Write a protein that binds this ligand. Structure first.
Ligand SMILES: NC[C@H]1CC[C@H](C(=O)O)CC1
Length: 80
């Protein structure tokens, strides 16, 4: 999928950050207990471990990481 703007409305399936590290799911609490999740941001498309922009950060989609000593990181979504 592609992103346009900040990718507020991005609903692709990228699952690794721009460093290629594997996301964590939005519905897991390991390795990280998330502040953003499907519970809380029901309208945010927080599916699977996919990159999303819940907070509309000018830096584009990110996800929680399966690196325990690294809480999140941004994903590299090509523009739209
Ligand atoms: N600026 C995106 C960023 C927002 C807070 C966050 C957290 O919930 O801990 C990590 C990612």
């Amino acid at each position: 999928e592609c992103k346009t703007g900040n990718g507020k409305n991005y609903r692709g399936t990228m699952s690794k950050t721009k460093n290629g590290i594997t996301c964590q799911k939005w519905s897991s609490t390991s390795p990280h207990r998330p502040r953003f999740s499907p519970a809380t941001h029901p309208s945010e498309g927080l599916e699977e471990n996919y990159c999303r922009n819940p907070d509309n950060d000018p830096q584009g989609p990110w996800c929680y990481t399966t690196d325990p000593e690294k809480r999140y990181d941004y994903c590299d979504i090509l523009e739209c």
